[PDB]
Write a protein that binds this ligand. Sequence first.
Ligand code: HEM
Ligand code: HEM
Ligand code: ZN
Lengths: 414, 416
Amino acid sequence: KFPRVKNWELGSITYDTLCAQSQQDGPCTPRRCLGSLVLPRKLQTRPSPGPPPAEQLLSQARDFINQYYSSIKRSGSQAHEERLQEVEAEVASTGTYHLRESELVFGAKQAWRNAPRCVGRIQWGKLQVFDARDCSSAQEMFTYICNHIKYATNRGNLRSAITVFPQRAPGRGDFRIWNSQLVRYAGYRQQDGSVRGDPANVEITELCIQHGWTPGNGRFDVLPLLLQAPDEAPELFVLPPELVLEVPLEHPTLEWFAALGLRWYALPAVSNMLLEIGGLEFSAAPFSGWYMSTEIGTRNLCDPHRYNILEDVAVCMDLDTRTTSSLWKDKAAVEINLAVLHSFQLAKVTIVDHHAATVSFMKHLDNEQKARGGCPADWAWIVPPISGSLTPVFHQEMVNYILSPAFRYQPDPW
Amino acid sequence: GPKFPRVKNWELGSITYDTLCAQSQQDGPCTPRRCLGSLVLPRKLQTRPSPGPPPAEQLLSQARDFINQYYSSIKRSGSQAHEERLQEVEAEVASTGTYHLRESELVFGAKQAWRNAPRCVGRIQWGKLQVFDARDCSSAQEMFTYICNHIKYATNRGNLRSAITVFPQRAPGRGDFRIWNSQLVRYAGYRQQDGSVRGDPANVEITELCIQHGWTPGNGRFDVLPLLLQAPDEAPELFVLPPELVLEVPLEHPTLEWFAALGLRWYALPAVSNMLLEIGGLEFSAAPFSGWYMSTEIGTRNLCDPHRYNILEDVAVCMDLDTRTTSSLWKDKAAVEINLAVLHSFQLAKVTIVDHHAATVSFMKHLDNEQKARGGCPADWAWIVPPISGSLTPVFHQEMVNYILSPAFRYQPDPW
Ligand code: HEM
Ligand code: HEM
Ligand SMILES: [Zn+2]
């Protein structure tokens, strides 16, 4: 029934009762655990050409409204009762409903709070929510996105934010941001299949070019945005360079590191995920916080299928790349992460290292145990890509499950 | 597409389907509602002491399954020998309540158990395992002799050889053969006045049990514990391993000359001894097994875990790093050098060891061989990816499917 959760470093034990509130199934079964899988095989967000079963939508809506009124300590009040009736009334007549700004705000923060793979949830209560539901064109989307970026960046003192565009509607196309993040470096396929820039963005880079974008030939060329209004071909929009803050990478002691010409943007803003609140779906709701240094230093720069700079840094450090046992990869990885941290701190841009970040997450886990009796967490994503066991979360057992409001993956619009 | 889990490798973009999981005959801890994959000891396999004889009906089904696996492995499925063997087993269980395995069946089962272990990254070596049959063992003293022979053969002066020694299976109402220690080689953990621990905090209980049983304790940081061996229905007897048999490696760093002064060291033979080997329903409560270390087990986990030797700060101070702020990555720097120290020292002493890069690369090969041979491979991601430099190794980017296959190694309650 209720899982016993143990921390092997401290010997402490807790019981997760929150998981009982889950109404959505994951990929696992008693026969086999599919926890390491990144994307769902079925838990997707299928098309919306038809109205979602009123019975189903209604229950999810009631449950959300119930959550909302509990949050403001007004459960069972007059307003609570009348709000439910409003929702009932709108669904019965139109097959859908709409959230009030205050409810939307509460919903966005809860979705973040419930995200199992996010290590920075201790900040969940501090999120600037921009209501962009009164958007009717890709151009309007572009303006909203620029205001989000200006606000979130705040000249280096990053502030968590989310912009919410119109919800999905039956039989009508979705508002969508084709790019996976608001800021991405182009990936150009060249010569023998090799790639100049970010290999992860090859497909999107090409799509932009096909829609009239004049490509560059650099390793860090900020991509343009392909914003799409309902049932309309996406449109191309270039981001004002002065809005895209970047940080040149250099090393605290290694003089030559700067010569490598490496750099990375300050703002991590996911834009391809779907936000679900009370049965309503927001196909375009970009959110951003700040980077944890390992995302850049380890994954973006060192992943084999990414910038894969490990060997270069290794040769520069004149390390023995002849054998694995010299641990040259481990050594370069650490300096590269040090460079990222040093650089961001120098440029006065917000960032958090994996040690500070995971310590804060352990606090969050404790806060959530008292508040809700548990905290859904995906161990594989919570533990950093380097120095895993050197952080507290490694020794902490975790229970993973789906709670709503929630951020979910959705099909690529093309 | 195929009605089986779709497994993706994100580095190579390659895809495979696991059909082997369809063979699993035992449920794990997860459900569609929540994933409990990260739990170390989920009350599942946990072979809790089941005294009273097992349901002849359940044992038989398991035995029939194992025998089918065996004859399939020798390509004689459906043969006369296969059906006659099935008849033996059912008849032996009918009259005695249990049965026994033929020699080659034990060898096959022992290797399959290793092959089936989801948390073992060294399974590419599964086919090469020396199976010592010790099912004739009748005394705790004899257990000691067998164990000493195992250590000698496995250590082989540094050129380690994988091996397992199987003691008599569990019998109805009869006491179990048991090795109280978690490993054949373990360092003592002495509780102190201030409340701290000298030695390995992981072995405080076993250390205290050895004392309660007449062991005169030492006071070092690396004192090899004696063995508490238990024969059926008898109190455990204490045995001290001859020092000449326990090969150890002093740790030194290739460039940091002061590292050797730290006086750190580790033993060469990793021999798990508290796990239960289950084959066709039969239970081998005492079946110690050993291979060789993957360097991160010693350098990262044993030496740097907070609840273990916890030497991170000491080494960082010696490296003169800023241990007052996380952003200096002092923990990451010290960990790397400590791991390098382990690899270097073992190589120097000519003692077999494999670094996490080599090991994970070889496991990827194993996954490929197994995809072709069985249509899948049960793997526990959290345990396969190394404790340091995770995404720098290939296994990190490889999705994995975890499930229980039998024969298998399982945890079992402590005898005390
Ligand atoms: C304030 C700083 C924040 C930091 C330090 C942070 C850090 C992280 C990290 C490291 C990951 C995993 C990345 C990976 O391993 O690929 C992650 C995932 C995630 N975070 Fe956060 N996060 C923060 C704020 C936010 C905000 C504001 C939201 C939403 C409003 C959010 C929503 C999520 C979600 C949904 C995921 C999973 C995305 C996926 O499945 O790909 N995060 N976060
Ligand atoms: C040949 C060298 C081998 C290497 C390098 C190796 C390495 C490993 C490693 C790194 C672990 C996980 C350690 C941890 O994170 O705590 C492990 C677990 C395991 N290995 Fe292997 N292994 C090898 C041989 C063996 C042998 C010979 C057997 C048995 C016949 C075996 C059975 C297992 C089992 C059952 C586990 C899991 C035990 C547990 O859950 O605590 N391994 N192995
Ligand atoms: Zn699972």
